[PDB]
Short mmCIF file of C-alpha atoms and ligand atoms in Angstrom, two decimals:
data_model
loop_
_atom_site.label_atom_id
_atom_site.label_comp_id
_atom_site.label_asym_id
_atom_site.label_seq_id
_atom_site.Cartn_x
_atom_site.Cartn_y
_atom_site.Cartn_z
CA UNK A 1 -17.96 -4.37 12.38
CA UNK A 2 -21.45 -3.08 11.57
CA UNK A 3 -23.55 -2.33 8.51
CA UNK A 4 -25.33 0.98 8.01
CA UNK A 5 -28.07 2.45 5.85
CA UNK A 6 -28.54 6.24 5.90
CA UNK A 7 -32.05 7.41 4.95
CA UNK A 8 -33.72 10.74 4.16
CA UNK A 9 -35.75 10.48 7.43
CA UNK A 10 -34.58 12.79 10.18
CA UNK A 11 -35.02 10.99 12.37
CA UNK A 12 -35.63 7.42 11.18
CA UNK A 13 -38.34 5.43 12.93
CA UNK A 14 -37.57 2.01 14.35
CA UNK A 15 -40.60 0.59 12.43
CA UNK A 16 -39.19 1.87 9.15
CA UNK A 17 -35.60 0.78 9.84
CA UNK A 18 -36.89 -2.72 10.86
CA UNK A 19 -39.15 -2.85 7.83
CA UNK A 20 -36.09 -2.11 5.61
CA UNK A 21 -34.14 -4.90 7.29
CA UNK A 22 -36.97 -7.44 6.75
CA UNK A 23 -37.39 -6.55 3.03
CA UNK A 24 -33.58 -6.66 2.73
CA UNK A 25 -33.39 -10.07 4.47
CA UNK A 26 -35.98 -11.59 2.12
CA UNK A 27 -34.13 -10.14 -0.90
CA UNK A 28 -30.88 -11.82 0.29
CA UNK A 29 -32.81 -15.02 1.16
CA UNK A 30 -31.99 -15.10 4.86
CA UNK A 31 -33.93 -14.90 8.13
CA UNK A 32 -34.81 -11.38 9.37
CA UNK A 33 -33.49 -12.70 12.69
CA UNK A 34 -29.97 -12.95 11.32
CA UNK A 35 -29.86 -9.15 11.60
CA UNK A 36 -28.74 -8.41 15.18
CA UNK A 37 -27.68 -5.46 17.31
CA UNK A 38 -30.20 -3.24 15.53
CA UNK A 39 -30.51 0.50 16.09
CA UNK A 40 -31.82 3.70 14.48
CA UNK A 41 -30.02 6.89 15.42
CA UNK A 42 -30.65 10.09 13.46
CA UNK A 43 -31.29 9.05 9.85
CA UNK A 44 -29.07 5.99 10.29
CA UNK A 45 -29.97 2.33 10.68
CA UNK A 46 -27.17 0.13 12.12
CA UNK A 47 -26.92 -3.66 12.55
CA UNK A 48 -24.64 -6.63 12.62
CA UNK A 49 -25.15 -10.10 11.15
CA UNK A 50 -25.29 -13.51 12.93
CA UNK A 51 -23.29 -16.56 11.70
CA UNK A 52 -25.69 -17.66 8.86
CA UNK A 53 -26.18 -20.91 6.84
CA UNK A 54 -26.27 -18.91 3.59
CA UNK A 55 -22.90 -17.34 4.67
CA UNK A 56 -23.58 -13.69 3.69
CA UNK A 57 -21.40 -11.05 5.33
CA UNK A 58 -21.99 -7.37 6.09
CA UNK A 59 -20.12 -6.52 2.94
CA UNK A 60 -22.60 -8.76 1.05
CA UNK A 61 -25.78 -7.31 2.61
CA UNK A 62 -24.86 -3.59 2.32
CA UNK A 63 -23.73 -4.17 -1.28
CA UNK A 64 -27.11 -5.75 -2.18
CA UNK A 65 -28.94 -2.94 -0.38
CA UNK A 66 -27.23 -0.48 -2.75
CA UNK A 67 -28.01 -2.70 -5.75
CA UNK A 68 -31.80 -2.91 -5.15
CA UNK A 69 -32.12 0.46 -3.37
CA UNK A 70 -34.96 1.34 -5.79
CA UNK A 71 -37.18 -1.52 -4.56
CA UNK A 72 -36.13 -1.01 -0.91
CA UNK A 73 -37.17 2.64 -1.14
CA UNK A 74 -40.61 2.07 -2.74
CA UNK A 75 -41.45 -0.70 -0.26
CA UNK A 76 -40.53 1.46 2.78
CA UNK A 77 -41.51 4.96 1.67
CA UNK A 78 -38.11 6.44 2.29
CA UNK A 79 -34.94 7.24 0.39
CA UNK A 80 -31.54 5.53 0.75
CA UNK A 81 -28.76 8.08 0.68
CA UNK A 82 -25.91 5.59 1.34
CA UNK A 83 -24.79 2.17 2.63
CA UNK A 84 -21.58 0.37 3.73
CA UNK A 85 -19.64 -1.14 6.64
CA UNK A 86 -18.25 0.68 9.72
CA UNK A 87 -15.73 -0.76 12.15
CA UNK A 88 -14.51 0.08 15.61
CA UNK A 89 -11.91 -1.88 17.62
CA UNK B 1 -7.46 -13.11 -7.93
CA UNK B 2 -9.93 -14.85 -10.24
CA UNK B 3 -13.61 -15.76 -9.93
CA UNK B 4 -15.03 -19.14 -10.82
CA UNK B 5 -18.28 -21.05 -11.44
CA UNK B 6 -18.21 -24.83 -11.73
CA UNK B 7 -21.07 -26.29 -13.74
CA UNK B 8 -22.24 -29.78 -14.49
CA UNK B 9 -21.45 -29.26 -18.24
CA UNK B 10 -19.01 -31.46 -20.16
CA UNK B 11 -17.74 -29.26 -21.49
CA UNK B 12 -19.24 -25.89 -20.60
CA UNK B 13 -19.78 -23.87 -23.82
CA UNK B 14 -18.42 -20.38 -24.44
CA UNK B 15 -21.92 -19.08 -25.16
CA UNK B 16 -23.21 -20.45 -21.81
CA UNK B 17 -20.30 -19.24 -19.65
CA UNK B 18 -20.46 -15.80 -21.24
CA UNK B 19 -24.25 -15.67 -20.72
CA UNK B 20 -23.73 -16.35 -17.02
CA UNK B 21 -21.44 -13.29 -16.82
CA UNK B 22 -23.89 -11.13 -18.80
CA UNK B 23 -26.72 -11.97 -16.38
CA UNK B 24 -24.43 -11.26 -13.47
CA UNK B 25 -23.42 -7.96 -15.11
CA UNK B 26 -26.99 -6.72 -15.31
CA UNK B 27 -27.67 -7.68 -11.65
CA UNK B 28 -24.56 -5.96 -10.28
CA UNK B 29 -25.24 -2.92 -12.55
CA UNK B 30 -22.04 -3.08 -14.65
CA UNK B 31 -21.03 -3.54 -18.30
CA UNK B 32 -20.46 -7.22 -19.15
CA UNK B 33 -17.04 -5.98 -20.39
CA UNK B 34 -15.96 -5.26 -16.83
CA UNK B 35 -15.49 -9.08 -16.86
CA UNK B 36 -11.99 -9.84 -18.23
CA UNK B 37 -9.65 -12.83 -18.79
CA UNK B 38 -12.65 -15.07 -19.49
CA UNK B 39 -12.35 -18.83 -20.07
CA UNK B 40 -14.36 -21.98 -20.18
CA UNK B 41 -12.25 -25.04 -19.38
CA UNK B 42 -13.96 -28.39 -18.79
CA UNK B 43 -17.00 -27.62 -16.61
CA UNK B 44 -15.61 -24.36 -15.23
CA UNK B 45 -15.88 -20.73 -16.06
CA UNK B 46 -13.06 -18.45 -14.89
CA UNK B 47 -12.82 -14.69 -14.94
CA UNK B 48 -11.34 -11.50 -13.52
CA UNK B 49 -12.98 -8.13 -13.06
CA UNK B 50 -11.73 -4.66 -14.03
CA UNK B 51 -11.58 -2.20 -11.09
CA UNK B 52 -14.78 -0.13 -10.68
CA UNK B 53 -16.73 2.80 -9.13
CA UNK B 54 -18.75 0.57 -6.82
CA UNK B 55 -15.92 -1.23 -4.96
CA UNK B 56 -17.48 -4.39 -6.48
CA UNK B 57 -15.23 -7.34 -5.89
CA UNK B 58 -15.10 -10.79 -7.39
CA UNK B 59 -16.53 -11.77 -4.04
CA UNK B 60 -19.66 -9.62 -4.73
CA UNK B 61 -20.29 -11.27 -8.10
CA UNK B 62 -19.97 -14.88 -6.73
CA UNK B 63 -22.31 -13.93 -3.92
CA UNK B 64 -24.65 -12.47 -6.60
CA UNK B 65 -24.59 -15.80 -8.50
CA UNK B 66 -25.79 -17.63 -5.36
CA UNK B 67 -28.80 -15.35 -5.05
CA UNK B 68 -29.80 -15.67 -8.74
CA UNK B 69 -28.72 -19.28 -9.26
CA UNK B 70 -32.15 -20.45 -10.45
CA UNK B 71 -32.36 -17.58 -12.95
CA UNK B 72 -28.76 -18.34 -14.20
CA UNK B 73 -29.60 -22.06 -14.55
CA UNK B 74 -32.91 -21.26 -16.29
CA UNK B 75 -31.16 -19.05 -18.87
CA UNK B 76 -28.09 -21.21 -19.71
CA UNK B 77 -29.33 -24.85 -19.62
CA UNK B 78 -27.02 -26.11 -16.87
CA UNK B 79 -26.63 -26.74 -13.11
CA UNK B 80 -24.23 -24.57 -11.01
CA UNK B 81 -22.31 -26.86 -8.63
CA UNK B 82 -19.73 -24.53 -7.09
CA UNK B 83 -18.76 -20.90 -6.91
CA UNK B 84 -15.68 -18.97 -5.64
CA UNK B 85 -12.76 -16.56 -5.58
CA UNK B 86 -9.13 -17.73 -5.63
CA UNK B 87 -5.61 -16.21 -5.70
CA UNK B 88 -2.70 -17.82 -7.57
CA UNK B 89 0.18 -17.58 -5.17
CA UNK C 1 -15.97 6.20 4.57
CA UNK C 2 -12.56 6.82 6.14
CA UNK C 3 -10.15 4.55 8.00
CA UNK C 4 -8.95 6.03 11.28
CA UNK C 5 -6.47 5.40 14.07
CA UNK C 6 -7.20 7.39 17.28
CA UNK C 7 -3.98 8.11 19.31
CA UNK C 8 -3.19 9.50 22.78
CA UNK C 9 -1.54 12.57 21.12
CA UNK C 10 -3.77 15.64 21.45
CA UNK C 11 -3.36 16.79 18.73
CA UNK C 12 -1.51 14.22 16.65
CA UNK C 13 1.43 15.32 14.48
CA UNK C 14 1.29 14.75 10.68
CA UNK C 15 4.78 13.24 10.92
CA UNK C 16 3.58 10.69 13.54
CA UNK C 17 0.41 9.95 11.53
CA UNK C 18 2.40 9.36 8.32
CA UNK C 19 4.89 7.17 10.25
CA UNK C 20 1.96 4.98 11.40
CA UNK C 21 0.84 4.66 7.80
CA UNK C 22 4.35 3.70 6.66
CA UNK C 23 4.52 0.88 9.26
CA UNK C 24 0.97 -0.28 8.47
CA UNK C 25 1.85 -0.31 4.74
CA UNK C 26 5.02 -2.32 5.52
CA UNK C 27 3.00 -4.97 7.38
CA UNK C 28 0.31 -5.31 4.74
CA UNK C 29 3.01 -5.50 2.04
CA UNK C 30 1.65 -2.40 0.18
CA UNK C 31 3.31 0.79 -0.93
CA UNK C 32 2.96 3.63 1.64
CA UNK C 33 1.64 5.53 -1.36
CA UNK C 34 -1.46 3.29 -1.36
CA UNK C 35 -2.88 5.27 1.55
CA UNK C 36 -4.54 8.36 0.09
CA UNK C 37 -6.60 11.29 1.38
CA UNK C 38 -4.50 11.42 4.52
CA UNK C 39 -5.29 13.95 7.35
CA UNK C 40 -4.45 14.26 11.05
CA UNK C 41 -7.23 16.02 12.97
CA UNK C 42 -7.24 16.20 16.76
CA UNK C 43 -5.83 12.87 18.06
CA UNK C 44 -6.93 10.95 14.98
CA UNK C 45 -5.27 9.82 11.77
CA UNK C 46 -7.81 9.44 8.88
CA UNK C 47 -7.12 7.93 5.42
CA UNK C 48 -8.50 5.91 2.52
CA UNK C 49 -6.87 3.34 0.27
CA UNK C 50 -6.32 3.12 -3.49
CA UNK C 51 -7.90 0.16 -5.29
CA UNK C 52 -4.97 -2.24 -5.05
CA UNK C 53 -3.78 -5.48 -6.67
CA UNK C 54 -3.83 -7.44 -3.37
CA UNK C 55 -7.62 -6.72 -3.16
CA UNK C 56 -7.50 -5.20 0.39
CA UNK C 57 -10.61 -3.15 1.27
CA UNK C 58 -10.52 -0.09 3.56
CA UNK C 59 -12.07 -2.18 6.40
CA UNK C 60 -9.65 -5.03 5.72
CA UNK C 61 -6.58 -2.85 6.06
CA UNK C 62 -7.89 -1.30 9.26
CA UNK C 63 -8.55 -4.82 10.61
CA UNK C 64 -4.89 -5.57 9.90
CA UNK C 65 -3.88 -2.37 11.76
CA UNK C 66 -5.84 -3.74 14.70
CA UNK C 67 -3.77 -6.98 14.54
CA UNK C 68 -0.45 -5.11 14.55
CA UNK C 69 -1.52 -2.51 17.22
CA UNK C 70 1.36 -3.42 19.50
CA UNK C 71 3.95 -3.09 16.74
CA UNK C 72 2.65 0.26 15.44
CA UNK C 73 2.63 1.59 19.02
CA UNK C 74 6.19 0.33 19.57
CA UNK C 75 7.65 1.81 16.33
CA UNK C 76 5.85 5.15 16.55
CA UNK C 77 5.86 5.95 20.28
CA UNK C 78 2.20 6.59 21.03
CA UNK C 79 -0.77 4.65 22.29
CA UNK C 80 -3.58 3.71 19.83
CA UNK C 81 -7.01 4.11 21.56
CA UNK C 82 -9.25 2.92 18.67
CA UNK C 83 -8.95 1.69 15.05
CA UNK C 84 -11.74 1.35 12.41
CA UNK C 85 -13.87 2.87 9.64
CA UNK C 86 -16.24 5.86 10.09
CA UNK C 87 -18.82 7.67 7.97
CA UNK D 1 -18.57 -21.19 2.23
CA UNK D 2 -15.10 -22.61 2.97
CA UNK D 3 -11.65 -21.09 2.82
CA UNK D 4 -9.09 -23.26 1.03
CA UNK D 5 -5.36 -23.61 0.40
CA UNK D 6 -4.22 -25.77 -2.52
CA UNK D 7 -0.67 -27.18 -2.04
CA UNK D 8 1.81 -29.18 -4.14
CA UNK D 9 1.26 -32.27 -1.93
CA UNK D 10 -0.61 -35.20 -3.48
CA UNK D 11 -2.11 -36.01 -1.17
CA UNK D 12 -1.81 -33.28 1.44
CA UNK D 13 -1.18 -34.68 4.94
CA UNK D 14 -3.65 -33.92 7.74
CA UNK D 15 -0.71 -32.95 9.94
CA UNK D 16 0.58 -30.39 7.38
CA UNK D 17 -2.89 -28.94 6.81
CA UNK D 18 -3.52 -28.41 10.51
CA UNK D 19 -0.04 -26.92 10.86
CA UNK D 20 -0.86 -24.27 8.22
CA UNK D 21 -3.96 -23.41 10.24
CA UNK D 22 -2.01 -23.25 13.51
CA UNK D 23 0.54 -20.80 11.98
CA UNK D 24 -2.32 -18.66 10.63
CA UNK D 25 -4.24 -18.64 13.90
CA UNK D 26 -1.08 -17.21 15.57
CA UNK D 27 -1.03 -14.32 13.08
CA UNK D 28 -4.70 -13.48 13.45
CA UNK D 29 -4.26 -13.82 17.30
CA UNK D 30 -6.93 -16.49 17.76
CA UNK D 31 -6.80 -20.05 19.01
CA UNK D 32 -6.06 -22.68 16.31
CA UNK D 33 -9.37 -24.34 17.43
CA UNK D 34 -11.14 -21.28 15.95
CA UNK D 35 -10.70 -23.00 12.66
CA UNK D 36 -13.51 -25.56 12.28
CA UNK D 37 -14.88 -28.00 9.61
CA UNK D 38 -11.31 -28.83 8.62
CA UNK D 39 -10.57 -31.36 5.89
CA UNK D 40 -7.68 -32.29 3.56
CA UNK D 41 -8.86 -33.59 0.15
CA UNK D 42 -6.08 -34.53 -2.25
CA UNK D 43 -3.82 -31.44 -2.45
CA UNK D 44 -6.26 -29.04 -0.80
CA UNK D 45 -7.02 -27.99 2.79
CA UNK D 46 -10.50 -26.69 3.45
CA UNK D 47 -11.86 -24.95 6.62
CA UNK D 48 -14.23 -22.45 8.23
CA UNK D 49 -13.87 -19.98 11.12
CA UNK D 50 -15.89 -19.40 14.27
CA UNK D 51 -17.56 -16.02 14.52
CA UNK D 52 -14.85 -14.32 16.41
CA UNK D 53 -13.76 -12.03 19.24
CA UNK D 54 -11.67 -10.19 16.55
CA UNK D 55 -14.06 -9.84 13.44
CA UNK D 56 -12.11 -11.87 10.78
CA UNK D 57 -13.76 -13.47 7.70
CA UNK D 58 -12.60 -16.40 5.54
CA UNK D 59 -11.43 -13.75 3.02
CA UNK D 60 -9.44 -12.04 5.81
CA UNK D 61 -7.65 -15.21 6.77
CA UNK D 62 -6.70 -16.17 3.19
CA UNK D 63 -5.36 -12.62 2.68
CA UNK D 64 -3.28 -13.30 5.80
CA UNK D 65 -2.00 -16.55 4.20
CA UNK D 66 -0.59 -14.46 1.31
CA UNK D 67 1.26 -12.12 3.67
CA UNK D 68 2.85 -15.07 5.42
CA UNK D 69 3.20 -17.49 2.50
CA UNK D 70 6.97 -17.91 2.99
CA UNK D 71 6.62 -18.63 6.73
CA UNK D 72 3.92 -21.12 6.06
CA UNK D 73 5.96 -22.91 3.36
CA UNK D 74 9.10 -22.76 5.55
CA UNK D 75 7.33 -24.50 8.47
CA UNK D 76 5.33 -27.14 6.56
CA UNK D 77 7.87 -28.09 3.83
CA UNK D 78 5.34 -27.77 1.00
CA UNK D 79 4.40 -25.12 -1.55
CA UNK D 80 1.19 -23.08 -1.59
CA UNK D 81 -0.21 -22.71 -5.08
CA UNK D 82 -3.66 -21.19 -4.52
CA UNK D 83 -5.72 -19.66 -1.72
CA UNK D 84 -9.39 -18.69 -1.86
CA UNK D 85 -12.93 -18.91 -0.57
CA UNK D 86 -15.42 -21.26 -2.24
CA UNK D 87 -19.03 -22.41 -2.02
CA UNK D 88 -20.72 -25.72 -2.85
CA1 CA E 1 -20.04 -4.80 -22.45
CA1 CA E 2 -12.47 -8.11 6.59
#
């Protein structure tokens, strides 16, 4: 499974995707480093999450990203169109 | 499934347990009334949630309480000891 | 978001797709009618799930499909290439 | 966070607890040893799960418990009264 955040940036810069993930991490009170397998493709930022002490899942992080999307946006200078969890087995 | 919060109160008051849910409501962007089947028994608050637009689960609200635990404790005069989501089977 | 099962049938029949869903429903102890917005396109079955009592998310049900891959394949008569949730 | 199963046994035996986990592991196709931080306290089994080759969460495994409640009860000779996922 993976988490995703679709932006209004076509395409999305790595700097901006990573900046989003760091602001997001601090908002969920975890290490930035707990976000792994990070990519930006098209307007989309993807990632997975490491086994963390706080115990947040991808469901947890993507949910919170939608809840504070207004502060995430204004911090990063981009718009968040949608968030959620993808899966491929 | 039901959600719970175990406090250090003996017993937890109805006003306090309810306040906890109201604070959670505002953070997860929902009407307090989306919380149903509400009880305070001993030190514990129990509750269910009505189904919603956001795919917000009882899991999302307990995870929310962990992030805002200081703010919940500050507003209701108690310590939060435990949090969770259980299914009577 | 949609759940999908990708098969080795090019294209996949609606009948075969719906059969998969009926076996998946059986094994997650939900009504077949809980799978909504069903389509077969190319080799893929796509679907979503109704908010249900058992509290199974779309990703959770597709994880379960992954766990019963062998049984779905056996009861339907096709190979499953991939299972998951897309955007 | 820990997953938990509350039984009718007071107290729950360590044997019976680890047997519930071994039945569940079989259903989620992982080794029983994938379940870690295992305890039995009074009637309740608690546990966690190694980040896994298959993706499953504590929520996922307790949902699996519900699907196989009768099998679990049939093999362990106890009743399951609650499942869930908690946090100290
Ligand atoms: Ca209200
Ligand atoms: Ca899951």
